């Protein structure tokens, strides 16, 4: 099924293509354009930009894009993290030229007409309310606001006061400063490399440079508490860990899977999760606990996420934190680290099974590192991680300053200091 | 000269005697309604006051002083591009519908 | 559209009412006008004669026709009242047009103080004209021969319908063919239903359209010509005058007005 | 508790064509 | 069944339903008037002008 | 797109309750959240 | 490839059988991970009113211990290799599967055989799962879509075992004993009704050797299936405390093996789906989606083709505020009628493209392919290749769509479920009249 | 707690048609002939009925 | 007109032609029946007896 072909053009744009010969083709344009590039004056600009695909472009009207992508059964999706924006077109392999022209019009020639932009402010409210129906969305937003001072402190969602105020000039300035060639990677699964090169030649010649150089994320170490009475309390307690793609980051991944990083068995007991066992020793109420890992280009957050009854919130949090401290005290066997490595490696290989997952991995790799590495190298990097590296990471979390975000009835929730 | 006839007709039409521009007098169908809805707010407010003043003038069966009349060479076709774009979108929808 | 179409319906119904009411005095003009305009319905192919004899209730205009015309004349204005109510219902969905042809929502006023008093003064003026007619020239707009009782064995030397039919009468007398004449007479009112489809101007009103005003006043003068001609005998000068007047009537509405509006559009660079 | 909801038996009102639960009701639909 | 066939052929579409109703109205008027008239002239047999006209 | 999405999006609608530890299991977050929108697909969030 | 050569290059599902009648099916790739599972022809439609819920209860107890792996030991083993154990139950099918590394397939296969063959069904665990299942019933009550589809099944298939819910009524949950569950497993977990599927980096010969080493004990070489009458009917649960109303309307659609399914799916793609978080809104080719976006008539709508062996639910589910239900019905039924009488070729082309895209995009990853293999061998006795699905889609036109939507939708009695502030949900006679057109 | 002219169901529609109806501030005498017609109609029904008492 | 024409509208015409001609036959039969138009009715076998 051929081999991944990865090249970097003189404009700095990256193009990577794997022709797997699958009936469907998937093309993603990955850009360093997340909400970490906003400042205090244009918060929510990139959220409206995420919602702004399928608006009129210089080469195709809004009706043309909607109707002409639905005609071929195609899909146009925009997925944002705090650091990246990925624009994906997926369709059958015979219709990829139409979808690629649409994608290139969307990213390189956006028009941001004032009436279409003013008729899109309502979906900021709709989109954010739908996301905030999950109690974790706002807890993670508050955790980033309380862990950072400036850059990663920015929400993926528009501030409520900024809704109805994100202007077309903010969108134009944003695209002109973040959608540049040396910040972009076009990655096609199920396409030929020369085709992607011709696509990258017909467009994507904005500046061939680095655009606006966003600020370094500054650790804050604060606490945000959202009393809202919800039956459950969601609490996140983190410290600064490491930037993505390092030996320390891999140690933090192994530590996440030592502590427990989500369930493997349906309705199970999370037996191999040491955090879960520590909490279930004393907390006989319904609960969930996992280790939380958030790695970024210039920083990272490692800690614990707990969901519990309002009454038992403190007991769950103290139990989890003391289990982490016990790992920091050098109590960590080789079998548990082998099991954690197996979990991590299996999860990594399973994430790239789908075309969406493999495309996302290749795109993030091309943005963060500017190079592609096969899963075998990733797995042996996981293998290289030693026991002392895990013990460390846990020490760094324990000794590190903490940021906390909780939501629910917090009358029994501790503070960062207690 | 075509422009002699054009300026003659602009004087004879006489909406300039009311302070109106040509695009103020257009019959408001659905295309024109969307075109007016897409105007920037300053142009919309100018249009609204111009039209209100002209209605106030015709209510008295009066016209403005000749100094205040819209000069033919100063008539701003402010609504023309918005209307052309609205009509282009309608025409595209219809071409799709066939 | 909806109020204009209701108005066309109202025009036809008012004409039917007035026509049937004019027969009620049973004078010479009543009888012979009913005779001519009912016999116009025989020109309909196949079912025409049966339709006329059924409307008559007999072989000619006679007792059955008079009593049924009284009944229809009594009932029709109430149908007109309902149609005028529907008319106003449709009109209030948009409000009124205005002389500039421009939407005026930024300058609306309450109806009561302003247009109740304006409509009342208009009503007083209408009453003045009507009372001058009633109290000073009661017979100015009528024919002396309707003061003679109807005589089925003696046709009046002239048979002219009421003045407010004469234009259509002139139109119907212009074309020799019976059925084509009737079709032209009906088209001279059904053509009002074509005005929206024939509108090619960028502007709603003719306030800023000098050439369309010229054509409009030609159409008014031509309708006055047709009224005069329909009041005159079918003789040498009046035949050719009425024929050219009818052709002009249709050629303005269907041809000259849209082309002239297109020319005006181009003169305004749109 | 929504799984505790059962439609009541409508056999008393049913047409004879559809009294059996084990039969396709399409096979009588046209006739019905 | 017969009613399944009638529905499938003549009742499913409203235009064909209406055509069946129109043709049936014509044939029903004919047959119903014929039957009702025969009943009325049997009840009143010999009493009507038609029954006795052939003597005059 | 062609496929409907594991979950459609009612705003102003209570989603689901969690009453058991078995249901609560997996609801804790482990990775930073991503936000996804789509022309013809339900919007999603992931943690 | 040109999508015609790419379909022809898709790997072939290899199928074998054990002497006991267990079918073994695998689609191989070069991926370093696999999904392997057991799909069983067992569901709630196989349960009567006294046993209803037993299959869900057995799925609940599946991973809680076998005679070889007591309690958490099994879970530990799965978790100790990075694998993921999952299970599900429907009214007709039950599945237990593992996502593992390709080198873990032997153990995974072993772990599955044990799970289906030697579940402990311990009474203490049965009581703990009784409590869990009651709490999950109350959790499912909170999901308006799940409730409205249970209601739709209950009224459409009233008097039949297809009206039953998967979980059963809470009274059965409280009353089911170990003897009930052992009887359910002994009568439904049989080799002739099971399929061992595997998709991914799995060689068929090796999987077959594993199945012969771990499943050969199973039943060698009987109550199963009665047809389920469909009923035009409505069930309306009014709760004006609910912010949004859910409405599900379905006619009797075809069963699994009926070719009419392919045109009908095409037709559903013409109507499409929508929710208020869509980019396209007013510009969508689906008329209902564009009207719903322009007028804000609903929060979402979806078409569905639920299939059982011999019947199914063909219809639509929508969510809207109290004052728009009527509109949502009017525009939805109208679309149905517009398809029955005036389908039109270009939107049939669009719907065909949508269907091909749905079929190809769905089969992305080892787990969807493993489910496709298992469920396909249960419903068709075969894995239908995507080239065949494409052949069946290519033979659809507007005449075919008009004919099949006429056969299933036009002048048919629907089954209707309403939940919430549904006072404006139209009366059943009005909906039934909306199922035909007088102009036509 | 309410103006009868706006609350009462018959007065509501009379009010909306002839009192509180927004009318253009600049409609001329040519716009009077609607009400005139409505008056003419009424006159014809009145006189006519009194004529019908003897005809 | 321009907004009309095109393959889709000609296909709609073809789709509705059977229904239109069926309603035409319905109107024809109903008009023949209501007015007792013998010009056609004299050819209908049993109805022929009514004249
Ligand atoms: C000829 C046969 C009728 C026919 O072709 O009707 C076509 C058409 C209805 O076609 P359809 O496709 O079945 O309607 C679907 C629509 O979306 C309409 O959908 P809807 O949900 O808005 O309405 C469904 C239902 C709603 O129900 C009604 O409209 C009520 C009908 C009157 C009930 C009694 C009112 C009080 C007296 O519509 C009808 O019943 C048919 C239209 C109204 C006919 C009224 C006849 C009244 C006779 C007295 O009706 C008309 O075109 C009306 C004018 C023609 C009538 C004959 C002349
Ligand atoms: C000195 C003798 C000749 C006068 C000048 C005539 C001429 O060539 O231009 C008329 C001059 C120029 O008309 P305009 O101001 O360009 O347009 C008038 C508006 O359409 C309409 O503007 P308005 O609604 O303010 O016009 C009211 C005007 C006109 O009222 C009417 O036209 C409605 C009454 C029916 C027609 C009466 C004709 C006499 O009333 C009168 O002139 C007669 C007053 C007594 C009747 C009740 C009103 O218009 C008038 O004086 C009104 C024309 C009719 C009366 C004469
Ligand atoms: C004095 C005033 C009161 C007098 C008495 C009043 C009581 C008697 C009259 C009314 C009786 C009930 C109504 C009977 C008709 C009816 O329900 O029609 C409903 C029906 C609908 O009934 P339906 O809903 O049961 O069936 C229609 C659905 N399909 C097509 C799938 C079967 O209306 C129509 O079908 C309209 C179209 C056909 C109309 C007839 C066409 C032919 C007419 C003759 C030729 C043309 C002239
Ligand atoms: C002699 C006949 C009556 C003449 C009355 C005066 C007249 O017609 O003046 C022209 C008048 C101007 O009205 P206006 O709305 O200002 O039009 C734009 C002008 N530049 O134009 C009008 O007022 C036209 C209004 C038409 C009113 C009905 C006339 C037709 C019916 C005749 C029967
Ligand atoms: C007396 C006239 C008939 C009255 C009794 C029938 C009736 O109320 O409705 C009959 C017909 C069918 O109407 P309905 O069932 O609402 O279906 C409309 C399309 N969905 O609804 C109609 O309006 C039929 C009109 C026929 C003309
Ligand atoms: C082809 C026309 C629209 C309706 C008329 C105007 C409204 C009206 O009738 O008002 C009657 C008014 C009612 O009382 P009012 O003071 O308005 O109440 C305010 C607190 N709710 O009336 C009153 O309060 C006064 C009632 C008596 C008025 C007449 C007294 C003298 C009679 C001689
Ligand atoms: C208004 C509708 C038309 C009414 C016309 C008068 C009614 C009438 O004449 O009905 C009876 C007639 C019977 O047919 P008849 O004219 O005698 O022609 C038979 C030739 N062998 O029937 C007809 O003439 C019916 C003709 C219908 C109209 C033409 C289509
Ligand atoms: C029974 C006789 C009629 C009555 C009582 C009547 C009544 C009215 C009234 C009261 C108005 C509002 C006031 C006005 O603008 O004049 C009006 C407006 C109107 N009528 Fe009539 N009308 C009648 C006949 C007609 C006829 C014959 C037509 C022509 C087809 C017509 C078309 C209109 C139109 C288009 C308007 C709106 C005019 C505008 O706002 O610019 N009506 N009618
Ligand atoms: C639309 C409103 C009406 C119009 C346009 C109208 C018109 C006419 C006309 C032109 C005449 C003949 C006048 C003449 O003798 O020269 C007449 C006569 C008559 N009308 Fe009316 N009429 C209307 C309403 C009514 C109504 C509603 C009635 C009955 C209540 C009525 C009763 C009569 C009677 C009895 C006559 C015969 C006596 C007479 O000649 O004056 N009219 N009508």
Residue numbers in the entry:
A (entry chain 3B): 21 to 438
B (entry chain 3S): 12 to 109
C (entry chain 3P): 110 to 379
D (entry chain 3E): 79 to 110
E (entry chain 3J): 5 to 60
F (entry chain 3I): 32 to 78
G (entry chain 3A): 2 to 222, 228 to 446
H (entry chain 3P): 1 to 55
Relevant lines from the article:
Here we report in situ structures of porcine respiratory SCs, determined directly through imaging porcine mitochondria by single-particle analysis combined with cryo-electron tomography (cryo-ET). Our in situ structures also capture numerous reactive intermediates within these respiratory supercomplexes, shedding light on the dynamic processes of the ubiquinone/ubiquinol exchange mechanism in complex I and the Q-cycle in complex III.
CIII2 transfers electrons from ubiquinol to cytochrome c (cyt c) and contributes to the proton gradient for ATP synthesis. Comprising three core subunits (cyt b, cyt c1 and the Rieske iron–sulfur protein (ISP)) along with eight auxiliary subunits, each CIII hosts four metal centres (haems bH and bL in cyt b, the [2Fe–2S] cluster in ISP and haem c1 in cyt c1) and two Q sites: Qi for Q reduction and Qo for QH2 oxidation. From our high-resolution maps, with local resolutions between 1.8 and 2.4 Å except for the dynamic ISP, we unambiguously identified all reactive centres and built atomic models of all endogenous ligands. Tails of these lipids create a hydrophobic, dynamic environment for Q-binding and release. Our structure showed a hydrogen-bond network near the Qi site, comprising water molecules, polar amino acid residues and the phosphate heads of three lipids (two cardiolipin and one phosphatidylethanolamine), which form a Grotthuss-competent system for proton transfer. The network could be divided into two hydrogen-bond chains primarily constituted of water molecules that link Q10 to the matrix. One of the two chains further branches above the three lipids that is directly involved in facilitating the proton transfer through the hydrogen network. These chains provide an explanation for how the rapid proton transfer process is achieved in the Qi site.
